[PDB]
RNA sequence: AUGGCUGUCGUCAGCUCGUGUUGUGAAAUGUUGGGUUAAGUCCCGCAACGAGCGCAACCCUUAUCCUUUGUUGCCAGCGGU
């Protein structure tokens, strides 16, 4: 479902060959992902997040990725959603215990 | 054989724990790398997050702008000398 630019793949020729069967090879010797592939996964996948959406679940986004830091901030105060847009805490989920008072000084 | 106390090296920046994670501990990580009072004191990065001891600060006997009590106290305006 091509409906934008720049989506088919990408980051080098050398890449993670497990992810083998989902790809493809671009002009630079950079490799091509397959989105006719990926339209049925987040068809699958998406659901998902509906379906515990339909349970209220509390969803998370992830990634510092300094460029779209804000991006994904900007959507996840879009609905109701959290966030972690910079410099993902090293045990802020298992350590959840003591992270949890990092917020209680806050 | 020793306490107390003392010089401890040197006022040198370093020591050790809760919790989580990676391994087997004599385990590490954190405390390490890039910049940093005179410094693990701070910022960034980081499987670490904070905590406590030195560090800083709190101490004034320290330099000085303003009031409460003039024996066995000091002088700007006025007298006797």
Redesign the pocket.
């Known amino acids: 479902m091509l409906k934008a630019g720049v989506h088919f793949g990408h980051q080098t020729r050398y890449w993670n060959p497990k992810m083998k069967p989902f790809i493809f090879g671009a002009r630079n010797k950079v490799h091509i992902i397959n989105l006719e592939k990926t339209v049925p996964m987040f068809n699958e996948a998406l659901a998902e997040l509906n379906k515990i959406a339909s349970r209220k679940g509390k969803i998370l986004f992830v990634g510092?990725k300094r460029a779209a830091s804000e991006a994904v901030k900007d959507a996840a105060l879009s609905c109701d959603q959290f966030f972690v847009n910079?410099?993902?805490?090293?045990?802020?989920?298992?350590?959840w215990?003591?992270?949890r008072?990092?917020i209680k000084?806050l």
């Open positions: 510092t910079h410099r993902w805490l090293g045990g802020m989920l298992t350590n215990k003591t992270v008072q990092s000084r």
